[PDB]
Amino acid sequence: SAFDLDVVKLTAQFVARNGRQFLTQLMQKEQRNYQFDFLRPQHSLFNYFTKLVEQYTKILIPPKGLFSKLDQVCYRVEWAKFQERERKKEEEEKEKERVAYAQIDWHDFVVVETV
């Protein structure tokens, strides 16, 4: 897949600075169906493309700026674990309900009125 990866990432590199300026010209010059598919949102890989470009677009963000930098990400993790536990418990209770519903006499009738 090295080829596909490389072309996606390259057209993504140029597409990140020239946007469709160099790629939108390449598509019409070369004439590629493959190139057209890459440009298009029909071809699945397109999505990942939208990723790479964004990423490169990001590198252009703080060019000329250095990064001079955990607890939070840990706490988020913790939260996720908690939520997971709630989900589990719920599933359990539901299970109980299914058991009892399946296990009671629906023939022990004693009605009062009607609508």
């Binding site: 070369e30 990423q55 703080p62 000329k64 840990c74 993790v77 674990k81």
Partner: protein, 135 residues
């Protein structure tokens, strides 16, 4: 030659991967951070520390996590230590690192070695995996 954009990209991506790893860790067993933070509290007085209840119940938000034994807590803390080392290194190199005719020019050379029958699913998977032993 080598497009710096790709390198800096891969760097930010790896940093992201590491942060995500040590964050997953801090998630499964909050003690990892809590423990640490508590000590930090008595060295740098300013440090803000979580609600005591959280610490005790070993929870970060709603879910109370299973208590781990000391050897594991320490282990993971040293692992996170080396992780943070890697991160600091990458951050460093990154700080030190940070047309159409050329587009077709390179896209042409990309045609090189067309017959390369091989599946390539090992860039983010080998890293994600590289930071997440047994069978």
């Amino acid at each position: 030659m080598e497009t710096i954009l790709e390198q800096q990209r891969r760097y930010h991506e790896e940093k992201e991967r590491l942060m995500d790893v040590m964050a997953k860790e801090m998630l499964t067993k909050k003690s990892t951070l809590r423990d640490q933070i508590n000590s930090d509290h008595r060295t740098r007085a300013m440090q803000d520390r979580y609600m005591e209840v959280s610490g005790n119940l070993r929870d970060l938000y709603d879910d109370k996590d299973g208590l781990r034994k000391e050897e594991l807590n320490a282990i993971s803390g040293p692992n996170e230590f080396a992780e943070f080392y890697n991160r600091l290194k990458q951050i460093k190199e990154f700080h030190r690192k940070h047309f159409e005719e050329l587009l077709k020019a390179r896209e042409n050379p990309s045609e090189e070695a067309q017959n390369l029958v091989e599946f390539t699913d090992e860039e983010g998977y080998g890293r994600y995996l590289d930071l997440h032993y047994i069978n």
